[PDB]
């Protein structure tokens, strides 16, 4: 019994951390095999960060102007290339704690665990999402540029996002690790700003599933709905549209319950439209969107109480 | 920017699962040195030395991976089995055995089968359960902080109560709060809001700019403590007070300006607003864990 926001054990994620230092700019880079991949923007000198010509930037620097740490050994900068907005230093030494690993972009909704760095040293670890306007909501002072977001099912860690920035609203920007960019952010110092955010939909019915699991109904109701007629209420709530994709991932915890998806709708639908009326659904008063259903599954019995 | 509920890297303490099984039983088990530490309910009114007694070494398989350790010698420590291994754990890290106080937080590394499947970060409440997220299979699960690159543990689960909560004892055996380790008519406590951590919250809401709380008021320590009595709130204590001191300097509002916030929220509740994303009153963050996470302390 019990909820959680859980993240994944970080060990095999903190064998890899490592410091790389440009002139001045200190940040986190993740070394795997012969490879230091960290965001480029290590070789801006802040005023640079207003229109940074980052090719123009890297062709004047060598090997030996990057400095990589390794707990208290320094690494051999070998080789260097950029790929989109991470800067990729080929050392002289393979990592012997690489562990198994691949390179996944997610989509919103998608949740990760956070393993947050200052001078190539975890300092902490936490559980977040991806959330619909592709900012994450999560906790970073300066120096944390370059930790990284990941997933470990089984023994593979799936490397899936590597912090850039932090915008003004106090929200998070940053890549997939080949340098793409979650959402229309630039790794310049721009004028931009997060777009409105919504409600992750499925995530709220996921966890509204996971509540009757451990044993709780009371915000169930006689009522079902089509999906359109949920989507139109819902959106007045801003909350993300739900699409027949999301309804079938649903169904193994739907069968699981014996509550249809579209009856959780329904509740939801009520849910957004009276509150909660001083009660609580798993610890909390608000109405939880950062568990997917997978992660339901994942940390919740397969014995509903 | 941000606030997260965040665990310390568990990696020194991920190299220390083990998988205990004697008989019908399997739970998880902590390797440091040549001592495997587990729940002596492994062994399972119960007499413990009665049952003990008709254990040989062989008996007890411990896995650490796809190895098995050869348990050489047993011994039995208040509610914890110390299992003589003849391997010394290579990865045995830096570490202390703690017993903590309620209201103190801690991280704790949820296991099945000695694997390592989350982390997550909880406190001990004043009824001295966790209100954690364990299944059948994860006894044997540890809590733990780390100071520096020593890892203090301070948590070993051995049961879940009625109500979902779990009971556990500190790495010497001692059950925190008044538990048993057996199977019978048990309960948790009327369970108490942790104040200096509600405080220590809001007091992180003001370093990343939530304000709305905050009013010209003051109060008496003795005024506060009225009204923390009338909402089960625990009572603040001067040494409460004295550790607030820090963030009390950072934000330039006294801790019983800040405890007069705290009455009005009590006493008037948010009215459809939020802090730092709640629209509860926090308090499973310490005045450490605030000052850590708004610092940027490395291990
Ligand atoms: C809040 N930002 C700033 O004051 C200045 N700033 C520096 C840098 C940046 O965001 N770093 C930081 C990252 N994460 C958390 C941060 C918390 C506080 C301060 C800085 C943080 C940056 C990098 C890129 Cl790729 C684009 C823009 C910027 C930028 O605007
Ligand atoms: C809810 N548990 C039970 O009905 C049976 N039960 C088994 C065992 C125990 O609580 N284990 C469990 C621990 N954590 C999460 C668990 C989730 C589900 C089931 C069992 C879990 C136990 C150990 C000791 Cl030392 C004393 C009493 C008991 C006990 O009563
Ligand atoms: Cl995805
Ligand atoms: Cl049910």
Redesign the interface.
């Known amino acids: 019994?019990?909820?959680?926001?859980?993240?994944?054990?970080?060990?095999?994620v903190?064998?890899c951390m490592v410091q790389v230092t440009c002139g001045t700019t200190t940040l986190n880079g993740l070394w795997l095999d012969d490879v230091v991949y960290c965001p480029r923007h290590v070789i801006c000198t802040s005023e640079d960060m207003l229109n940074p010509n980052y090719e123009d930037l890297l062709i004047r620097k060598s090997n030996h102007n990057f400095l990589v740490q390794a707990g208290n050994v320094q690494l051999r900068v070998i080789g260097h290339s950029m790929q989109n907005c991470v800067l990729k230093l080929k050392v002289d030494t393979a990592n012997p704690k690489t562990p198994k690993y691949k390179f996944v972009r997610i989509q919103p909704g998608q949740t990760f665990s956070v393993?947050?760095?200052?001078?190539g040293?975890?300092?902490?670890?936490?559980?977040?999402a991806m959330r619909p306007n592709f900012t994450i909501?999560?906790?970073?002072?300066?120096?944390?540029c370059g930790s990284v977001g990941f997933n470990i099912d089984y023994d593979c860690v799936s490397f899936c996002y590597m912090h850039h920035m932090?915008l003004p609203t106090?929200?998070?920007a940053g890549t997939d690790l080949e340098g793409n960019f979650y959402g229309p952010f630039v790794d310049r110092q721009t004028a931009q700003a997060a777009g409105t955010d919504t409600t992750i939909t499925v995530n709220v019915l996921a966890w509204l599933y996971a509540a009757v699991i451990?044993?709780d109904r009371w915000f169930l109701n006689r009522f079902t709905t089509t999906l359109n007629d949920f989507n139109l209420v819902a959106m007045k709530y801003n909350y993300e549209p739900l699409t027949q994709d999301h309804v079938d991932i649903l169904g193994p915890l739907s069968a699981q319950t014996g509550i249809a998806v579209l009856d959780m709708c329904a509740s939801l639908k009520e849910l957004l439209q009276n509150g909660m009326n001083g009660r609580?659904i798993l610890?909390?008063?608000?109405l939880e969107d950062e568990f997917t259903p997978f992660d339901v599954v994942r940390?919740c019995?397969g014995v509903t109480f």
């Open positions: 019994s019990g909820f959680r926001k859980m993240a994944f054990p970080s060990g095999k903190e064998g393993l947050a760095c200052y001078n040293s975890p300092s902490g670890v936490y559980q977040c909501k999560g906790s970073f002072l300066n120096g944390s932090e106090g929200v998070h451990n044993g609580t610890g909390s008063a608000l940390q019995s």
